[PDB]
Amino acid sequence: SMENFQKVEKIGEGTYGVVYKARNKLTGEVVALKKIRLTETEGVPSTAIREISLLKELNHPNIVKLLDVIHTENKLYLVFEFLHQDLKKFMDASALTGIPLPLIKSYLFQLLQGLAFCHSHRVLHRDLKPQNLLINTEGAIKLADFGLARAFGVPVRTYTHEVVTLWYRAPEILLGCKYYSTAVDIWSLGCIFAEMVTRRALFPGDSEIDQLFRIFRTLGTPDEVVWPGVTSMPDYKPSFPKWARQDFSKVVPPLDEDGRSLLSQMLHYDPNKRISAKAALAHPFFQDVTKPVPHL
């Protein structure tokens, strides 16, 4: 079953299972193998059932391609196109150069295409972070690890609360809203945009309240004017400190006017007013977008 694959090295561990780099001995294709150890447990995990059914539907240049599923009685193996590294490792490596604006713009543009495609196919990713965004030598970036993803309905009902890595987590989740939607993935992407610019996390909280206060000190503590309904949210407290909103030219100083304008629409408090991936693709920030190869 796995006879044509030659393991090369372990890549790492994501939401679930283990991922290896392997090569197909017959075609020469280099692949990423996601191994899932399986009876007497709870059978095939929900994360795997979701990742597979949903990735089979989502064929897009900016979404990691699932090639095959290999399914014995003991092990399940997902065969994915191989990507060369993650954004996080790339940003670490750009320590001294910084990331050229054209590459930031290209990556953001590509990530928004990937995400617009998910959302138009009723899929929420729910774990966007630099570690799950994978790059190749040809300048592509692709959404990966759909282990936390799910299919949603129109309009949404209540889904799992414990979602999105804390630094990338939207305020509506932090505040306990019973409905969250596609706008949570845009929040994450906005944090990532800021991070590609500064090369550090925009909101590195170490607990949920820390995370909220960091967001509040940057964008202002939300009230009923900025975000109708906030004060009625389950985990809103009238005791919250009331910080003034920072001017964005100070949030991400290297960013020019179109950049700051886009970021601010991606980090809007009110999910309803937060920009969609689809609408963001036409933002003026992208007027001169190209596709630079990175500097590996």
Partner: protein, 258 residues
């Protein structure tokens, strides 16, 4: 979030064709019949109630069963095994907290083992090639509900009740697509409660008219009239609950006047 409402509906319209079970499969099953399938679906309704599962989970499970049986011959003593594994799959896909495999073993009243349920899960996945994200009557209704002026909780619950009844009876409902059953159920609900009709805004959205819905509507009207006398009664009892506004106690209209 109406930025993608249209993209999503269009895509669900594409996928429901691809996810459709084979209309005449029961005819080709040596050991099982329509009435045996009705018994199973009615039991899954009960399971869904007992464990407080989403209605969407129930609809997905039926889709998985009908698709599985579209190509796989099954003996009557194994139909409940098929159904149990489908419910377990549907729960894993759709629920925040699915029941554990032990709970699924327990509600078959130890008819089957844990090993059998897990092996059947694996078989269902193989046969469906892991393609579990199927459109349902529920997913369409929930979109159609946005077109009410204004929203009516009884319209909603009654439309759900009617869509659910369609699950029980493969003849005739296997011949209708989820979007069509939902349109018929929504119009039927709306007409029953408020006297109003399939809105013009949903003609623009779906392209369906009362004319194109008529075949399904007439079947669903009859199902609705004969519901108190159907051998399977679990959906009617479920829809007596206050959670669904007791809509199953509403009187069906005598005529549709179409």
């Amino acid at each position: 979030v109406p930025d993608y409402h249209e993209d999503i509906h269009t895509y669900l319209r594409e996928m429901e064709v691809k996810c459709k079970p084979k209309v005449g499969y029961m005819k080709k099953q040596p050991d099982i019949t329509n009435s045996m399938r009705a018994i199973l679906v009615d039991w899954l309704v009960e399971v869904g109630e007992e464990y407080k599962l989403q209605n969407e989970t129930l609809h997905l499970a039926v889709n998985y069963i009908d698709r599985f049986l579209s190509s796989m011959s099954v003996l009557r003593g194994k139909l409940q095994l098929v159904g149990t594994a489908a419910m377990l799959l549907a729960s894993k896909f759709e629920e925040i907290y699915p029941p554990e495999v032990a709970e699924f073993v327990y509600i078959t009243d130890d008819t089957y083992t844990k090993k059998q349920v897990l092996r059947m899960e694996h078989l269902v996945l193989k046969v469906l090639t892991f393609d579990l994200a199927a459109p349902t009557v529920n997913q369409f209704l929930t979109q159609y509900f946005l077109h009410q002026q204004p929203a009516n909780c009884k319209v909603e619950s009654l439309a759900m009740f009617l869509g659910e009844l369609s699950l029980i009876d493969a003849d005739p409902y296997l011949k209708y697509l989820p979007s069509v059953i939902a349109g018929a159920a929504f119009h039927l609900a709306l007409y029953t409660v408020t006297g109003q009709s399939w809105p013009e805004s949903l003609i623009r959205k779906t392209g369906y008219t009362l004319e194109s819905l008529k075949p399904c509507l007439m079947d669903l009207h009859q199902t609705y009239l004969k519901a108190p006398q159907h051998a399977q009664q679990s959906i009617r009892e479920k829809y007596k609950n206050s959670k669904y506004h007791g809509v199953s106690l509403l009187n069906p209209p005598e005529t549709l006047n179409l």
